[PDB]
Design a protein around this nucleic acid. Structure first.
Lengths: 190, 173, 284, 154, 95, 153, 173
RNA sequence: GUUAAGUCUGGUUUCCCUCCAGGGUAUCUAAGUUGA
């Protein structure tokens, strides 16, 4: 969540990442670049040009210059090299924070929820049937890699199966309607 | 009483002329009222018999068939192999409801025979490929609903809502 | 926009009963609290806004301040009278609401008790609730989406329960209205007015002289214009439950508890009601 | 540097607390803080704000006292126990509006002391309404807690 | 349909905050600490959700008999002060 | 080190002894089950404002706390809730003193003035991200102790 | 550096006698950017005796003189009858503050010393009469606004708000 | 008997949450020394 001072461009939410998460993605990409024939020079150079701006909070798809994230944390941003095209495509700015701030922002971005359990014949809570529970919000982006070793079946897999994988169900609580998720392959989205 | 017949809607071309009465008086259960089709019947535990166009009783609760419900009779030369029955309209699994239905229906379902030689095995089907849809529209709806192509531009609407409305299960033969 | 404001009393009197009374009074309060400023050549120069009438009249010349203050007192009284005469009751939407709600409950297999009660004396329900609070200081329990005053179901349930535990002990109450370990067996809807005689609201005053005073040397009347619910206004609400037991205690409780108060200031005979009609629809 | 809702509440409440000399003023301010937030929710910020301005019974020396409180911290709110309580809650709201940079101090003062600027202040508040109603109630909730912690009942 | 930076404030202020109390049965006055607020969502408010089901023979009968005859329910709390009644209109049935 | 469970034992001893009415004990048990989760979700300073609001630190419960620091026989007087919140505030201030986050010398001439109490709250605001990470396991222990010892009402 | 100049909005005509420099550079701070006139400073504490107008100071804070902020030294035949002053521009009272400031703003304001003989009388004014608006709109702004005449197409957005956004407290004696 | 003139006041104070439920159940690991 954002309350953007110094912007007539009204954003209700915004994407937040930190430099440590970016360093981890860079390590993934560096490692699997050597261990395979593939290369991700576009993604790698995007990540590298962002990482070059370490020390200062920055925004990618806007020029906010200041904001109030998750109701508590003031930031003072900078513009990345005159609109460096950002990795994701959601018409919402991506902010890259110093990891100290980003830690608290990301903690405040999680969803904690009390649930209860009701006796099946007297509409009153059961004893012990009360607990909390944590979700990661919808619209959250995780970065993973799927690596395969040479084989016949590996080619059929990478060419027939991974081209019909879009929506899968991660996690648990799949009856509260949690865990629907969209896999978007870096090759055909970057 | 208002005799009814369940003219079901598979894709195959044995569907045009199977009901005698077109309108009767001025009543039909199924409405087409500028929002698409309305008050469509759905039967469960029955599969389409595209081969020898009919529907045979299966037992699976996942096998359903659709098709509008109108006023008609078996032309006095049929219903040797039909199911006909009298329901209080509270037993009708009517999708796409518009209003209420009076009482005491009398439906004629295009039935089949057991035929316990070959085993049945049904597949989920679709009604797409409007090359299929158009002949049914020009054969099933018009001969029953003459107001179709009388005061309506919302016909392509009926086309995309047959795209999105009618499915069924057929014996995969 | 300020033009919505300086033209809001015209709206009250022309759109009568079809305006959102909550927002209407809320916006009127801005004019009321900036009276001296809305009068300094900002009447929008119209001819049916009550606001230039306070430019024709002269109440004082030795003090512009006193002029504004007396004009503002008059304007408060006039706002009360405007709301009371113009905002009348059309209770067709409520009759439809309750008929449909009763059909819903018949589907859910409840046993409904539809009770109709009538105001006998100017009632005060929700006197601390926000409606006219920013002008009058008092308020009325107002549902801004039915655009009506209403009696909360919690209030009616609390009064019925207070009586039932008065005359049946603090245990049969909890047998009926439950406790921290059982849910109640009786449900209450809010009460809405379905038919009045002439008015729905009515201006009134209260003028404490001595409340909270030491002697006569600090006594002073402070008069409090406010709005009350007119007499002869008929409210109705539903009471539904699934067990047949609780039908007995509520029936006989209804006529009795109403003749004594159902709102505020019952002690001086204000929120006195009258059981107009009761009716029980058993399900199964 | 930027002060969040609770820190700004601390600073505002601290500048108010030292100005309410008599303790009845403090207790009436406690009663204010404890319900003006629910009022602001139910009636809207602008109606309730002008209600507070009226109930502060300005058009006296109370006005220059209230503007002096902004800077002197040696200033005193003068009036009856009702007038100064509303005057101090008004200072609370003005301090928020000024520190969050929503409205400048000069314009607020001049709108508070002039028949003319008051109406355009109404216009401006109807312009800026989302920017205020977004988060003023958290700061005012913190004010409520500070009041019912640092002051007692009657 | 408002843009979000204003529709957010509008929809949030659009909820009913009713204050209830508890009464001293003997003083017939309000108990100390017996005052609180509750948020309601108005009548005729509309919520949208989906009911999903894996392949099964139970799923068939559920979607085809149960979900037809299910129109009214009671949601949430305060069921005895009349809150929480709800009608479920399926897009499938009547858009 | 795990000496925070020991600190919790000491604090819970002092509180369990200063709550003479068993209703006050059960109310403190409720405060213990709730406020640690509220510090987790909503942060420290919000929950601390909430707590000092409902503790009603007039002038007298205050001295009961300063004495409860020293005299192992000091008692807390007031309503069950009014003393449970003050007992939990004592838990917090106790941890802050023992772990030397703020000098007890300062915390003492704050609980006696209302003119340095606001400075106490300001100081606690300058240290909220520290306290928030420190007190976690200590308050978890206090909660566990309360569920273990005090009877569920 | 740069030293600006502030002139009122009268109903009379003595404006050319002193203002010389249109811009003196590249771009102003006062603007007609199709959003309305912005950064129009407001004086509070002066009175306008505007027959051959020059400002006189009052004691009231509700007396406000409002105009626009021209960049340029007026006539270079003055600085002994003008109230010269260079505020650091965060002690200036403006309208619709959009952008930043030059961190220091020297202002030359036409001034008439009081010379107390009568007792001052201040009357507010709202202006009208689209002609009496245009005849200031594009003769004296035109003298100072030159990037108009090619982009300021609908002059209405200024001719309509000059009669609502400006006012003063007149003296007339 | 007659003349004139109204004037003063213009809602306050409390209560802002209380109690209970703060996890329960199931899985707790399965399957798999050879050459000099």
């Amino acid at each position: 969540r954002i309350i953007e001072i110094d912007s007539a461009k009204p954003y209700v939410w915004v994407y937040v990442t930190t430099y440590e998460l970016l360093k981890k993605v860079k390590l993934y990409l560096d490692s699997i670049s050597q261990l395979s024939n593939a290369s991700f020079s576009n993604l790698k150079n995007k990540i590298d040009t962002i990482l070059a701006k370490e020390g200062k909070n920055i925004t990618l798809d806007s020029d906010l210059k200041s904001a109030i994230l998750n109701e508590d944390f003031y930031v003072e941003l900078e513009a990345l090299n005159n609109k460096i095209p950002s990795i994701i495509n959601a018409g919402v700015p991506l902010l890259v924070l110093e990891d100290s701030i980003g830690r608290e922002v990301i903690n405040r971005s999680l969803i904690r929820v009390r649930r209860i359990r009701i006796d099946r014949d007297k509409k009153v809570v059961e004893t012990g049937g009360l607990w909390s529970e944590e979700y990661v919000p919808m619209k959250t982006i995780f970065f993973s890699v799927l690596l395969g070793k040479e084989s016949k079946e590996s080619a059929i897999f990478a060419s027939c199966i991974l081209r019909n994988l879009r929506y899968v169900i991660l996690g648990g609580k799949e009856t509260i309607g949690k865990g629907i998720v969209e896999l978007r392959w870096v090759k055909d989205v970057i | 009483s208002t005799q009814r017949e369940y003219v079901f809607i598979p894709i195959t071309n044995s569907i045009t002329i199977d009901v005698k009465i077109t309108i009767g008086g001025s009543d039909h259960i199924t409405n087409i009222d500028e929002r698409g089709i309305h008050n469509v019947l759905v039967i469960t535990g029955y599969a389409v018999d595209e081969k020898n166009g009919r529907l045979v009783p299966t037992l699976d609760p996942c096998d359903y068939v659709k098709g509008i419900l109108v006023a008609g009779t078996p032309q006095q030369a049929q219903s040797n192999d039909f199911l006909t029955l009298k329901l209080p309209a509270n037993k009708l699994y009517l999708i796409r409801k518009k209003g209420n239905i009076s009482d005491d229906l009398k439906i004629y379902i295009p039935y089949s025979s057991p035929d316990a030689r070959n085993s049945m095995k049904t597949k989920p089907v679709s009604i797409s490929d409007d090359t299929i849809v158009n002949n049914i529209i020009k054969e099933v709806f018009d001969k029953i609903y003459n107001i179709t192509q009388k005061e309506k531009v919302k016909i392509e609407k009926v086309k995309e809502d047959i795209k999105e409305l009618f499915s069924y299960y057929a014996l995969e033969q | 926009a300020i033009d919505f404001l300086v033209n809001i009393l015209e709206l009250i009197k022309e759109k009568q009963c079809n305006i959102n009374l909550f927002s209407a009074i809320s916006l009127t309060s801005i004019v009321y609290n900036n009276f001296g400023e809305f009068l300094s050549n900002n009447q929008s120069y119209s001819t049916n806004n009550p606001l230039l009438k306070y430019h024709i009249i002269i109440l004082n010349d030795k003090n512009k301040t006193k002029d504004v203050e007396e004009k503002r007192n008059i304007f408060k009284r006039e706002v009360a009278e405007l709301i009371s005469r113009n905002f009348k009751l059309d209770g067709e939407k409520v009759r439809n609401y309750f008929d449909s709600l009763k059909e819903v409950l018949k589907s859910l297999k409840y046993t409904i008790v539809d009770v109709e009660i009538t105001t006998r004396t100017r009632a005060l329900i929700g006197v601390s609730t926000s409606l006219g609070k920013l002008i009058f200081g008092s308020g009325i329990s107002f549902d801004p989406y039915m655009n009506l005053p209403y009696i909360p179901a919690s209030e009616i349930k609390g009064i019925v329960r207070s009586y039932i535990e008065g005359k049946l002990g603090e245990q049969e109450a909890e047998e009926i209205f439950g406790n921290e370990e059982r849910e109640g067996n009786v449900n209450f809807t809010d009460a809405y007015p379905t038919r009045s005689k002439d008015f729905l609201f009515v201006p009134d005053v209260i003028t404490p002289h001595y409340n909270g005073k030491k002697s006569e040397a600090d006594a002073e009347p402070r008069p409090v214009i406010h709005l009350t619910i007119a007499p002869k206004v008929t409210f109705r609400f539903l009471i539904y439950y699934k067990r047949e037991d609780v039908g007995k205690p509520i029936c006989d409780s209804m006529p009795i508890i109403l003749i004594r108060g159902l709102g505020a200031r019952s002690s001086v005979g204000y929120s006195l009601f009258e059981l107009r009609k009761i009716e029980v629809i058993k399900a199964a | 540097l930027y002060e969040e809702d609770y820190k700004l509440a601390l600073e505002a409440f601290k500048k108010v607390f030292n100005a309410l000399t008599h303790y009845g003023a403090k207790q009436a301010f406690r009663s204010r803080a404890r319900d003006l937030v629910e009022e602001i929710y139910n009636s809207g910020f602008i109606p309730t704000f002008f209600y507070i301005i009226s109930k502060a019974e300005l058009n006296s020396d109370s006005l220059d006292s209230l503007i002096s409180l902004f800077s002197s911290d040696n200033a005193i709110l003068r009036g009856s126990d009702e007038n100064v309580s509303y005057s101090a809650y008004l200072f609370i709201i003005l301090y928020y509006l000024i520190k969050r940079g929503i409205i400048e101090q000069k314009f607020l003062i001049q709108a508070l002391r002039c028949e003319k600027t008051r109406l355009d202040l109404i216009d401006k508040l109807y312009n800026l309404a989302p920017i205020i109603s977004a988060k003023i109630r958290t700061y005012l909730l913190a004010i409520k807690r500070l009041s019912e912690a640092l002051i007692e009942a009657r």
